[model samples]
Target chain A: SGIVQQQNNLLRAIEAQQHLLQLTVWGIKQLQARSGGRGGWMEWDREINNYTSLIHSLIEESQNQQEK
Target chain B: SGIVQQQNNLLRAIEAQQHLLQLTVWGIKQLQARSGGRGGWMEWDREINNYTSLIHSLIEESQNQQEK
Candidate 1:
């Protein structure tokens, strides 16, 4: 009973975190999609774009360059 | 009445913005002071503290502006 109860509590907290994560993702995607088209949202548009693009290139390097 | 009411509404919004700015100072001060806390940590904390103090000084200066 205690084991099952603990697992369920852990699951409840995990789901709570996932809910916040989903909200964060929703906000991120909306900004990413609309920032180039909108004001206020584009305040850090240039820096975020350059920073995110760097992460993208590093991911690409990991896939293509790491093995080679 | 309309112009006076509009000005009151604008003052309310300005006060609300100041409320938010005060909260921002609290938040950044917590982050910086807690580094009671690395490069990223140091760099991030430095900027927050820098910004918090700069804002502090600006507010102080503005308060003393008429006398100055």
Candidate 2:
């Protein structure tokens, strides 16, 4: 009972983060486009890349637990 | 027991989203600054406002549960 609920809590959190990430990526893309691929946006692009990696790992890790 | 673990799981997820919110804010600020308080950034400002409201509600709700 609790285990299932706990897992769902984790899943929901991950999904929330995923949604935020999409919004972030959209902003970053807009920045890059407006900047004409010059500066500023590159740093944000890198930052989002880091988050992308973290979220991907979290999703994979959670899926691993779900199968067991 | 599982109740404690489930609560902690929810707390951690809320914290993770909080962290992401900070990053989003930082990026939005940078965009606004670069735009010199012009167009474009206002839309993102509004978008972050939406996320800000959501995260704040989640935090308040979680705190209420923590006391019980």
Best-performing candidate as measured by lDDT: 2
Worst 10 residues of 2 chain B by lDDT: B59-68
After superposition, candidate 2 runs with Cα above 4 Å error:
A3-13, A37-68, B1-3, B6-10, B66-68
Expressed as tens digits, the lDDT of each residue in A36-65 for candidate 1 is 755655546666667556655654554455
Instruction: Please name the candidate that would achieve the greatest DockQ relative to the true structure.
Output: 2
Clash pairs, candidate 1, are: none
Q: Write down the lDDT of every candidate, Cα atoms only.
A: 0.42, 0.64
iRMS of each prediction: 22.6, 3.3
Model 2 Cα lDDT, one tens digit per residue, B1-66: 247765676677678767866787686567757767646557766766675566566555555544
Model 1 chain A is weakest, by summed lDDT over 10 consecutive residues, at A1-10
Q: Compared with the true structure, what per-residue lDDT tens digits does model 2 show for residues A1-68?
A: 33454455445555655666577677657666875764655776788789888888888777777654
Q: How would the docking of model 1 be graded?
A: incorrect
Per-model TM-score of chain B = 0.49, 0.59
Instruction: List CA RMSD, all candidates.
Output: 24.1, 4.8
- Which whole-number lDDT from 0 to 100 does residue B54 have in model 2? 65
